[PDB]
JSON list of C-alpha atoms in Angstrom, two decimals:
[
{"chain": "A", "resi": 6, "resn": "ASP", "atom": "CA", "xyz": [90.07, 84.79, 81.86]},
{"chain": "A", "resi": 7, "resn": "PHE", "atom": "CA", "xyz": [90.99, 88.42, 82.09]},
{"chain": "A", "resi": 8, "resn": "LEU", "atom": "CA", "xyz": [94.34, 89.70, 83.22]},
{"chain": "A", "resi": 9, "resn": "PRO", "atom": "CA", "xyz": [95.32, 92.14, 85.95]},
{"chain": "A", "resi": 10, "resn": "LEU", "atom": "CA", "xyz": [95.10, 95.88, 85.63]},
{"chain": "A", "resi": 11, "resn": "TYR", "atom": "CA", "xyz": [98.90, 95.74, 85.80]},
{"chain": "A", "resi": 12, "resn": "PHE", "atom": "CA", "xyz": [101.76, 93.48, 86.83]},
{"chain": "A", "resi": 13, "resn": "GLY", "atom": "CA", "xyz": [104.57, 94.75, 89.00]},
{"chain": "A", "resi": 14, "resn": "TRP", "atom": "CA", "xyz": [106.55, 94.66, 92.21]},
{"chain": "A", "resi": 15, "resn": "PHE", "atom": "CA", "xyz": [104.46, 95.64, 95.23]},
{"chain": "A", "resi": 16, "resn": "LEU", "atom": "CA", "xyz": [106.48, 96.97, 98.16]},
{"chain": "A", "resi": 17, "resn": "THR", "atom": "CA", "xyz": [105.98, 95.45, 101.58]},
{"chain": "A", "resi": 18, "resn": "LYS", "atom": "CA", "xyz": [104.27, 97.68, 104.12]},
{"chain": "A", "resi": 19, "resn": "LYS", "atom": "CA", "xyz": [107.56, 98.41, 105.85]},
{"chain": "A", "resi": 20, "resn": "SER", "atom": "CA", "xyz": [109.49, 99.14, 102.64]},
{"chain": "A", "resi": 21, "resn": "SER", "atom": "CA", "xyz": [106.61, 101.26, 101.32]},
{"chain": "A", "resi": 22, "resn": "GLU", "atom": "CA", "xyz": [106.59, 103.43, 104.47]},
{"chain": "A", "resi": 23, "resn": "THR", "atom": "CA", "xyz": [110.37, 103.79, 104.32]},
{"chain": "A", "resi": 24, "resn": "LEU", "atom": "CA", "xyz": [110.36, 104.95, 100.69]},
{"chain": "A", "resi": 25, "resn": "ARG", "atom": "CA", "xyz": [107.28, 107.13, 101.21]},
{"chain": "A", "resi": 26, "resn": "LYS", "atom": "CA", "xyz": [108.98, 108.94, 104.09]},
{"chain": "A", "resi": 27, "resn": "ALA", "atom": "CA", "xyz": [112.19, 109.33, 102.08]},
{"chain": "A", "resi": 28, "resn": "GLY", "atom": "CA", "xyz": [110.19, 110.87, 99.23]},
{"chain": "A", "resi": 29, "resn": "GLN", "atom": "CA", "xyz": [108.46, 113.36, 101.52]},
{"chain": "A", "resi": 30, "resn": "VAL", "atom": "CA", "xyz": [111.78, 114.50, 103.11]},
{"chain": "A", "resi": 31, "resn": "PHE", "atom": "CA", "xyz": [113.24, 114.94, 99.61]},
{"chain": "A", "resi": 32, "resn": "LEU", "atom": "CA", "xyz": [110.26, 117.06, 98.53]},
{"chain": "A", "resi": 33, "resn": "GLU", "atom": "CA", "xyz": [110.53, 119.21, 101.68]},
{"chain": "A", "resi": 34, "resn": "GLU", "atom": "CA", "xyz": [114.30, 119.64, 101.33]},
{"chain": "A", "resi": 35, "resn": "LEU", "atom": "CA", "xyz": [114.15, 120.39, 97.60]},
{"chain": "A", "resi": 36, "resn": "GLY", "atom": "CA", "xyz": [111.40, 122.98, 97.99]},
{"chain": "A", "resi": 37, "resn": "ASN", "atom": "CA", "xyz": [113.58, 124.81, 100.50]},
{"chain": "A", "resi": 38, "resn": "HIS", "atom": "CA", "xyz": [116.79, 124.66, 98.46]},
{"chain": "A", "resi": 39, "resn": "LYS", "atom": "CA", "xyz": [117.91, 128.08, 97.18]},
{"chain": "A", "resi": 40, "resn": "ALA", "atom": "CA", "xyz": [118.61, 126.77, 93.66]},
{"chain": "A", "resi": 41, "resn": "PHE", "atom": "CA", "xyz": [115.13, 125.27, 93.33]},
{"chain": "A", "resi": 42, "resn": "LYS", "atom": "CA", "xyz": [113.44, 128.43, 94.64]},
{"chain": "A", "resi": 43, "resn": "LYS", "atom": "CA", "xyz": [115.36, 130.58, 92.14]},
{"chain": "A", "resi": 44, "resn": "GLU", "atom": "CA", "xyz": [114.03, 128.47, 89.27]},
{"chain": "A", "resi": 45, "resn": "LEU", "atom": "CA", "xyz": [110.42, 128.48, 90.38]},
{"chain": "A", "resi": 46, "resn": "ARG", "atom": "CA", "xyz": [109.31, 130.21, 87.15]},
{"chain": "A", "resi": 47, "resn": "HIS", "atom": "CA", "xyz": [110.69, 127.24, 85.13]},
{"chain": "A", "resi": 48, "resn": "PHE", "atom": "CA", "xyz": [108.39, 125.10, 87.27]},
{"chain": "A", "resi": 49, "resn": "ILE", "atom": "CA", "xyz": [104.96, 126.71, 87.64]},
{"chain": "A", "resi": 50, "resn": "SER", "atom": "CA", "xyz": [103.26, 128.81, 84.97]},
{"chain": "A", "resi": 51, "resn": "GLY", "atom": "CA", "xyz": [100.75, 131.07, 86.76]},
{"chain": "A", "resi": 52, "resn": "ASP", "atom": "CA", "xyz": [100.92, 133.53, 89.66]},
{"chain": "A", "resi": 56, "resn": "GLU", "atom": "CA", "xyz": [106.49, 133.08, 98.29]},
{"chain": "A", "resi": 57, "resn": "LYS", "atom": "CA", "xyz": [107.32, 129.39, 98.76]},
{"chain": "A", "resi": 58, "resn": "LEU", "atom": "CA", "xyz": [105.85, 126.34, 97.00]},
{"chain": "A", "resi": 59, "resn": "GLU", "atom": "CA", "xyz": [105.35, 123.32, 99.30]},
{"chain": "A", "resi": 60, "resn": "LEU", "atom": "CA", "xyz": [106.07, 120.42, 96.96]},
{"chain": "A", "resi": 61, "resn": "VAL", "atom": "CA", "xyz": [104.28, 117.95, 99.20]},
{"chain": "A", "resi": 62, "resn": "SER", "atom": "CA", "xyz": [101.06, 119.91, 98.45]},
{"chain": "A", "resi": 63, "resn": "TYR", "atom": "CA", "xyz": [102.00, 120.33, 94.77]},
{"chain": "A", "resi": 64, "resn": "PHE", "atom": "CA", "xyz": [102.38, 116.54, 94.26]},
{"chain": "A", "resi": 65, "resn": "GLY", "atom": "CA", "xyz": [99.20, 115.88, 96.18]},
{"chain": "A", "resi": 66, "resn": "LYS", "atom": "CA", "xyz": [97.97, 112.92, 94.17]},
{"chain": "A", "resi": 67, "resn": "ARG", "atom": "CA", "xyz": [100.04, 110.28, 95.96]},
{"chain": "A", "resi": 68, "resn": "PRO", "atom": "CA", "xyz": [99.63, 106.52, 95.31]},
{"chain": "A", "resi": 69, "resn": "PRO", "atom": "CA", "xyz": [97.12, 104.92, 97.70]},
{"chain": "A", "resi": 70, "resn": "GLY", "atom": "CA", "xyz": [97.99, 101.61, 99.27]},
{"chain": "A", "resi": 71, "resn": "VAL", "atom": "CA", "xyz": [101.53, 100.38, 99.03]},
{"chain": "A", "resi": 72, "resn": "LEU", "atom": "CA", "xyz": [103.99, 101.85, 96.59]},
{"chain": "A", "resi": 73, "resn": "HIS", "atom": "CA", "xyz": [104.85, 99.75, 93.54]},
{"chain": "A", "resi": 74, "resn": "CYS", "atom": "CA", "xyz": [107.04, 99.40, 90.46]},
{"chain": "A", "resi": 75, "resn": "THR", "atom": "CA", "xyz": [104.99, 98.48, 87.41]},
{"chain": "A", "resi": 76, "resn": "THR", "atom": "CA", "xyz": [106.36, 96.15, 84.77]},
{"chain": "A", "resi": 77, "resn": "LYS", "atom": "CA", "xyz": [103.46, 95.77, 82.32]},
{"chain": "A", "resi": 78, "resn": "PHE", "atom": "CA", "xyz": [100.23, 97.77, 82.31]},
{"chain": "A", "resi": 79, "resn": "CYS", "atom": "CA", "xyz": [97.61, 95.32, 81.00]},
{"chain": "A", "resi": 80, "resn": "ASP", "atom": "CA", "xyz": [94.18, 96.98, 81.56]},
{"chain": "A", "resi": 81, "resn": "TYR", "atom": "CA", "xyz": [92.71, 93.49, 82.02]},
{"chain": "A", "resi": 82, "resn": "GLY", "atom": "CA", "xyz": [93.85, 92.41, 78.54]},
{"chain": "A", "resi": 83, "resn": "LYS", "atom": "CA", "xyz": [93.00, 95.59, 76.62]},
{"chain": "A", "resi": 84, "resn": "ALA", "atom": "CA", "xyz": [96.49, 97.06, 76.45]},
{"chain": "A", "resi": 85, "resn": "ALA", "atom": "CA", "xyz": [98.74, 96.13, 73.54]},
{"chain": "A", "resi": 86, "resn": "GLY", "atom": "CA", "xyz": [101.10, 93.26, 74.38]},
{"chain": "A", "resi": 87, "resn": "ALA", "atom": "CA", "xyz": [99.17, 92.36, 77.57]},
{"chain": "A", "resi": 88, "resn": "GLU", "atom": "CA", "xyz": [98.35, 88.75, 76.68]},
{"chain": "A", "resi": 89, "resn": "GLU", "atom": "CA", "xyz": [101.82, 88.18, 75.26]},
{"chain": "A", "resi": 90, "resn": "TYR", "atom": "CA", "xyz": [103.47, 89.46, 78.44]},
{"chain": "A", "resi": 91, "resn": "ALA", "atom": "CA", "xyz": [101.29, 87.45, 80.84]},
{"chain": "A", "resi": 92, "resn": "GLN", "atom": "CA", "xyz": [101.84, 84.12, 79.10]},
{"chain": "A", "resi": 93, "resn": "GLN", "atom": "CA", "xyz": [105.62, 84.33, 79.52]},
{"chain": "A", "resi": 94, "resn": "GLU", "atom": "CA", "xyz": [107.16, 81.54, 81.58]},
{"chain": "A", "resi": 95, "resn": "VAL", "atom": "CA", "xyz": [109.18, 83.99, 83.67]},
{"chain": "A", "resi": 96, "resn": "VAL", "atom": "CA", "xyz": [106.04, 85.91, 84.63]},
{"chain": "A", "resi": 97, "resn": "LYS", "atom": "CA", "xyz": [104.34, 82.75, 85.83]},
{"chain": "A", "resi": 98, "resn": "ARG", "atom": "CA", "xyz": [107.46, 81.46, 87.61]},
{"chain": "A", "resi": 99, "resn": "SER", "atom": "CA", "xyz": [107.98, 84.79, 89.46]},
{"chain": "A", "resi": 100, "resn": "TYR", "atom": "CA", "xyz": [104.34, 85.31, 90.48]},
{"chain": "A", "resi": 101, "resn": "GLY", "atom": "CA", "xyz": [104.33, 85.76, 94.25]},
{"chain": "A", "resi": 102, "resn": "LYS", "atom": "CA", "xyz": [108.15, 85.79, 94.46]},
{"chain": "A", "resi": 103, "resn": "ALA", "atom": "CA", "xyz": [110.04, 88.31, 96.64]},
{"chain": "A", "resi": 104, "resn": "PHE", "atom": "CA", "xyz": [112.60, 90.69, 95.10]},
{"chain": "A", "resi": 105, "resn": "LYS", "atom": "CA", "xyz": [114.83, 93.57, 96.18]},
{"chain": "A", "resi": 106, "resn": "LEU", "atom": "CA", "xyz": [114.52, 96.77, 94.14]},
{"chain": "A", "resi": 107, "resn": "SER", "atom": "CA", "xyz": [117.44, 99.18, 94.08]},
{"chain": "A", "resi": 108, "resn": "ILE", "atom": "CA", "xyz": [116.49, 102.90, 94.13]},
{"chain": "A", "resi": 109, "resn": "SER", "atom": "CA", "xyz": [119.40, 105.03, 92.94]},
{"chain": "A", "resi": 110, "resn": "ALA", "atom": "CA", "xyz": [117.78, 108.47, 92.63]},
{"chain": "A", "resi": 111, "resn": "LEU", "atom": "CA", "xyz": [114.70, 110.51, 93.39]},
{"chain": "A", "resi": 112, "resn": "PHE", "atom": "CA", "xyz": [113.34, 113.05, 90.87]},
{"chain": "A", "resi": 113, "resn": "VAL", "atom": "CA", "xyz": [110.85, 115.89, 90.36]},
{"chain": "A", "resi": 114, "resn": "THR", "atom": "CA", "xyz": [109.41, 117.59, 87.26]},
{"chain": "A", "resi": 115, "resn": "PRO", "atom": "CA", "xyz": [106.50, 120.04, 86.96]},
{"chain": "A", "resi": 116, "resn": "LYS", "atom": "CA", "xyz": [104.26, 116.96, 86.43]},
{"chain": "A", "resi": 117, "resn": "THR", "atom": "CA", "xyz": [105.49, 114.13, 88.71]},
{"chain": "A", "resi": 118, "resn": "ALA", "atom": "CA", "xyz": [107.73, 112.99, 91.54]},
{"chain": "A", "resi": 119, "resn": "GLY", "atom": "CA", "xyz": [109.25, 109.57, 91.77]},
{"chain": "A", "resi": 120, "resn": "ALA", "atom": "CA", "xyz": [112.05, 107.15, 92.47]},
{"chain": "A", "resi": 121, "resn": "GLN", "atom": "CA", "xyz": [114.35, 105.66, 89.86]},
{"chain": "A", "resi": 122, "resn": "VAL", "atom": "CA", "xyz": [114.65, 101.85, 90.06]},
{"chain": "A", "resi": 123, "resn": "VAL", "atom": "CA", "xyz": [117.74, 100.03, 88.73]},
{"chain": "A", "resi": 124, "resn": "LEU", "atom": "CA", "xyz": [116.72, 96.48, 87.89]},
{"chain": "A", "resi": 125, "resn": "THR", "atom": "CA", "xyz": [118.91, 93.42, 88.37]},
{"chain": "A", "resi": 126, "resn": "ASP", "atom": "CA", "xyz": [119.42, 91.05, 85.43]},
{"chain": "A", "resi": 127, "resn": "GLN", "atom": "CA", "xyz": [116.82, 88.67, 86.92]},
{"chain": "A", "resi": 128, "resn": "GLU", "atom": "CA", "xyz": [114.31, 91.52, 87.29]},
{"chain": "A", "resi": 129, "resn": "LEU", "atom": "CA", "xyz": [114.96, 92.69, 83.73]},
{"chain": "A", "resi": 130, "resn": "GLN", "atom": "CA", "xyz": [113.61, 89.35, 82.53]},
{"chain": "A", "resi": 131, "resn": "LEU", "atom": "CA", "xyz": [110.21, 90.57, 83.80]},
{"chain": "A", "resi": 132, "resn": "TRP", "atom": "CA", "xyz": [110.43, 93.81, 81.85]},
{"chain": "A", "resi": 133, "resn": "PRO", "atom": "CA", "xyz": [108.16, 93.87, 78.78]},
{"chain": "A", "resi": 134, "resn": "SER", "atom": "CA", "xyz": [109.33, 94.12, 75.18]},
{"chain": "A", "resi": 135, "resn": "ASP", "atom": "CA", "xyz": [106.52, 95.16, 72.82]},
{"chain": "A", "resi": 136, "resn": "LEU", "atom": "CA", "xyz": [105.12, 97.82, 70.48]},
{"chain": "A", "resi": 137, "resn": "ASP", "atom": "CA", "xyz": [103.70, 99.78, 73.46]},
{"chain": "A", "resi": 138, "resn": "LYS", "atom": "CA", "xyz": [107.22, 100.97, 74.31]},
{"chain": "A", "resi": 139, "resn": "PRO", "atom": "CA", "xyz": [107.33, 104.80, 74.11]},
{"chain": "A", "resi": 140, "resn": "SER", "atom": "CA", "xyz": [109.81, 106.69, 71.96]},
{"chain": "A", "resi": 141, "resn": "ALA", "atom": "CA", "xyz": [111.74, 108.25, 74.85]},
{"chain": "A", "resi": 142, "resn": "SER", "atom": "CA", "xyz": [112.86, 104.74, 75.84]},
{"chain": "A", "resi": 143, "resn": "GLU", "atom": "CA", "xyz": [114.73, 104.53, 72.52]},
{"chain": "A", "resi": 144, "resn": "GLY", "atom": "CA", "xyz": [118.46, 105.11, 72.97]},
{"chain": "A", "resi": 145, "resn": "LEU", "atom": "CA", "xyz": [118.41, 103.98, 76.59]},
{"chain": "A", "resi": 146, "resn": "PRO", "atom": "CA", "xyz": [118.90, 100.45, 77.93]},
{"chain": "A", "resi": 147, "resn": "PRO", "atom": "CA", "xyz": [115.83, 98.26, 78.43]},
{"chain": "A", "resi": 148, "resn": "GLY", "atom": "CA", "xyz": [114.17, 98.77, 81.82]},
{"chain": "A", "resi": 149, "resn": "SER", "atom": "CA", "xyz": [115.29, 102.39, 82.16]},
{"chain": "A", "resi": 150, "resn": "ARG", "atom": "CA", "xyz": [111.60, 103.40, 82.62]},
{"chain": "A", "resi": 151, "resn": "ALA", "atom": "CA", "xyz": [111.45, 101.39, 85.87]},
{"chain": "A", "resi": 152, "resn": "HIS", "atom": "CA", "xyz": [110.30, 103.67, 88.64]},
{"chain": "A", "resi": 153, "resn": "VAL", "atom": "CA", "xyz": [108.12, 104.13, 91.71]},
{"chain": "A", "resi": 154, "resn": "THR", "atom": "CA", "xyz": [105.65, 107.02, 91.49]},
{"chain": "A", "resi": 155, "resn": "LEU", "atom": "CA", "xyz": [105.64, 109.18, 94.61]},
{"chain": "A", "resi": 156, "resn": "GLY", "atom": "CA", "xyz": [103.20, 111.91, 93.54]},
{"chain": "A", "resi": 157, "resn": "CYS", "atom": "CA", "xyz": [101.51, 113.66, 90.60]},
{"chain": "A", "resi": 158, "resn": "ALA", "atom": "CA", "xyz": [100.24, 117.18, 89.97]},
{"chain": "A", "resi": 159, "resn": "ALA", "atom": "CA", "xyz": [96.45, 117.51, 89.95]},
{"chain": "A", "resi": 160, "resn": "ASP", "atom": "CA", "xyz": [95.79, 117.05, 86.23]},
{"chain": "A", "resi": 161, "resn": "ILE", "atom": "CA", "xyz": [98.56, 114.49, 85.56]},
{"chain": "A", "resi": 162, "resn": "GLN", "atom": "CA", "xyz": [98.11, 110.76, 85.26]},
{"chain": "A", "resi": 163, "resn": "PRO", "atom": "CA", "xyz": [100.54, 108.48, 87.18]},
{"chain": "A", "resi": 164, "resn": "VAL", "atom": "CA", "xyz": [101.93, 106.85, 84.01]},
{"chain": "A", "resi": 165, "resn": "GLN", "atom": "CA", "xyz": [103.54, 110.24, 83.24]},
{"chain": "A", "resi": 166, "resn": "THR", "atom": "CA", "xyz": [106.13, 109.47, 85.95]},
{"chain": "A", "resi": 167, "resn": "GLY", "atom": "CA", "xyz": [107.88, 106.88, 83.80]},
{"chain": "A", "resi": 168, "resn": "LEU", "atom": "CA", "xyz": [107.91, 109.14, 80.75]},
{"chain": "A", "resi": 169, "resn": "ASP", "atom": "CA", "xyz": [109.37, 111.91, 82.93]},
{"chain": "A", "resi": 170, "resn": "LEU", "atom": "CA", "xyz": [112.12, 109.61, 84.21]},
{"chain": "A", "resi": 171, "resn": "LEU", "atom": "CA", "xyz": [113.02, 108.59, 80.69]},
{"chain": "A", "resi": 172, "resn": "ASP", "atom": "CA", "xyz": [113.24, 112.24, 79.64]},
{"chain": "A", "resi": 173, "resn": "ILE", "atom": "CA", "xyz": [115.57, 112.92, 82.59]},
{"chain": "A", "resi": 174, "resn": "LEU", "atom": "CA", "xyz": [117.75, 109.94, 81.67]},
{"chain": "A", "resi": 175, "resn": "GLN", "atom": "CA", "xyz": [118.00, 111.21, 78.07]},
{"chain": "A", "resi": 176, "resn": "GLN", "atom": "CA", "xyz": [119.52, 114.38, 79.53]},
{"chain": "A", "resi": 177, "resn": "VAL", "atom": "CA", "xyz": [121.89, 112.31, 81.63]},
{"chain": "A", "resi": 178, "resn": "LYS", "atom": "CA", "xyz": [122.84, 110.11, 78.66]},
{"chain": "A", "resi": 179, "resn": "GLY", "atom": "CA", "xyz": [124.40, 113.15, 76.97]},
{"chain": "A", "resi": 180, "resn": "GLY", "atom": "CA", "xyz": [125.83, 114.56, 80.20]},
{"chain": "A", "resi": 181, "resn": "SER", "atom": "CA", "xyz": [123.37, 117.46, 80.29]},
{"chain": "A", "resi": 182, "resn": "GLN", "atom": "CA", "xyz": [123.08, 116.98, 84.05]},
{"chain": "A", "resi": 183, "resn": "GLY", "atom": "CA", "xyz": [126.53, 118.54, 84.32]},
{"chain": "A", "resi": 184, "resn": "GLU", "atom": "CA", "xyz": [127.98, 119.09, 87.73]},
{"chain": "A", "resi": 185, "resn": "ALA", "atom": "CA", "xyz": [125.68, 118.97, 90.73]},
{"chain": "A", "resi": 186, "resn": "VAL", "atom": "CA", "xyz": [124.07, 122.33, 91.44]},
{"chain": "A", "resi": 187, "resn": "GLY", "atom": "CA", "xyz": [124.17, 121.49, 95.15]},
{"chain": "A", "resi": 188, "resn": "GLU", "atom": "CA", "xyz": [123.81, 118.89, 97.84]},
{"chain": "A", "resi": 189, "resn": "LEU", "atom": "CA", "xyz": [121.17, 117.50, 100.14]},
{"chain": "A", "resi": 190, "resn": "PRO", "atom": "CA", "xyz": [122.05, 115.36, 103.17]},
{"chain": "A", "resi": 191, "resn": "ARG", "atom": "CA", "xyz": [121.53, 112.07, 101.25]},
{"chain": "A", "resi": 192, "resn": "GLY", "atom": "CA", "xyz": [123.07, 112.92, 97.90]},
{"chain": "A", "resi": 193, "resn": "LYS", "atom": "CA", "xyz": [124.01, 115.36, 95.16]},
{"chain": "A", "resi": 194, "resn": "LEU", "atom": "CA", "xyz": [121.33, 117.52, 93.54]},
{"chain": "A", "resi": 195, "resn": "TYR", "atom": "CA", "xyz": [121.17, 117.92, 89.74]},
{"chain": "A", "resi": 196, "resn": "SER", "atom": "CA", "xyz": [119.22, 120.52, 87.79]},
{"chain": "A", "resi": 197, "resn": "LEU", "atom": "CA", "xyz": [118.38, 119.35, 84.27]},
{"chain": "A", "resi": 198, "resn": "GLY", "atom": "CA", "xyz": [116.52, 122.53, 83.29]},
{"chain": "A", "resi": 199, "resn": "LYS", "atom": "CA", "xyz": [112.84, 123.03, 82.57]},
{"chain": "A", "resi": 200, "resn": "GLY", "atom": "CA", "xyz": [111.79, 122.20, 86.11]},
{"chain": "A", "resi": 201, "resn": "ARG", "atom": "CA", "xyz": [113.55, 118.83, 86.16]},
{"chain": "A", "resi": 202, "resn": "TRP", "atom": "CA", "xyz": [115.51, 117.85, 89.30]},
{"chain": "A", "resi": 203, "resn": "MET", "atom": "CA", "xyz": [117.32, 114.67, 90.34]},
{"chain": "A", "resi": 204, "resn": "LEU", "atom": "CA", "xyz": [118.78, 113.69, 93.73]},
{"chain": "A", "resi": 205, "resn": "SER", "atom": "CA", "xyz": [121.50, 111.09, 93.08]},
{"chain": "A", "resi": 206, "resn": "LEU", "atom": "CA", "xyz": [121.63, 109.07, 96.29]},
{"chain": "A", "resi": 207, "resn": "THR", "atom": "CA", "xyz": [125.02, 108.66, 97.95]},
{"chain": "A", "resi": 208, "resn": "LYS", "atom": "CA", "xyz": [123.86, 105.19, 99.03]},
{"chain": "A", "resi": 209, "resn": "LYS", "atom": "CA", "xyz": [121.27, 103.26, 97.08]},
{"chain": "A", "resi": 210, "resn": "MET", "atom": "CA", "xyz": [118.03, 102.45, 98.85]},
{"chain": "A", "resi": 211, "resn": "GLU", "atom": "CA", "xyz": [116.85, 98.83, 98.76]},
{"chain": "A", "resi": 212, "resn": "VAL", "atom": "CA", "xyz": [113.19, 97.92, 99.11]},
{"chain": "A", "resi": 213, "resn": "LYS", "atom": "CA", "xyz": [111.50, 94.57, 99.41]},
{"chain": "A", "resi": 214, "resn": "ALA", "atom": "CA", "xyz": [108.68, 93.93, 96.97]},
{"chain": "A", "resi": 215, "resn": "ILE", "atom": "CA", "xyz": [106.57, 91.00, 95.74]},
{"chain": "A", "resi": 216, "resn": "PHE", "atom": "CA", "xyz": [105.92, 90.45, 92.03]},
{"chain": "A", "resi": 217, "resn": "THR", "atom": "CA", "xyz": [102.20, 89.98, 91.35]},
{"chain": "A", "resi": 218, "resn": "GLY", "atom": "CA", "xyz": [99.14, 91.36, 89.55]},
{"chain": "A", "resi": 219, "resn": "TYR", "atom": "CA", "xyz": [96.87, 94.16, 90.75]},
{"chain": "A", "resi": 220, "resn": "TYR", "atom": "CA", "xyz": [93.18, 94.10, 89.87]},
{"chain": "A", "resi": 221, "resn": "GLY", "atom": "CA", "xyz": [91.71, 97.36, 91.18]}
]
């Protein structure tokens, strides 16, 4: 019996459209913000205005989702150990609400930061496959929804990018907001990294299950 490609929370069609539209408005607003335009050298590295919706053109097909454990059908480290957990089996097909507190952009990815409840954290993996940038931050800090990737970037980069942003925030390197968008304060973390801290958290409905590809 092989396992899914990955486990995670799959947004309902309505929630996925709502978050997808929010992400597009953020990308449009950010690309027009004077502070972002001034930093455009810290963002691209070759040779007017950059339309971030075109820049992050590899957008997830289907519904948006929040991965818990990438399994690659059993080939990833920790995959079989994760899937045999009681909580994974008990939650399979169950509905959850995911809290989105912030949207972010780097030169590689765009996504949404997810803040897991204590019940949802029980579904978060704990294994060797954990990357180093998750060290020093609370478990589950990687939890995100990918909104878009640059052409040569793989989607998994989005979670590594979020962790790197949260390492800045941990030490206060976000500083004061450089500005404001209609739905929250805008933070520049340097090196092409931007975070919109939402005035009001977004909530999305999602079903925990396995995706097979």
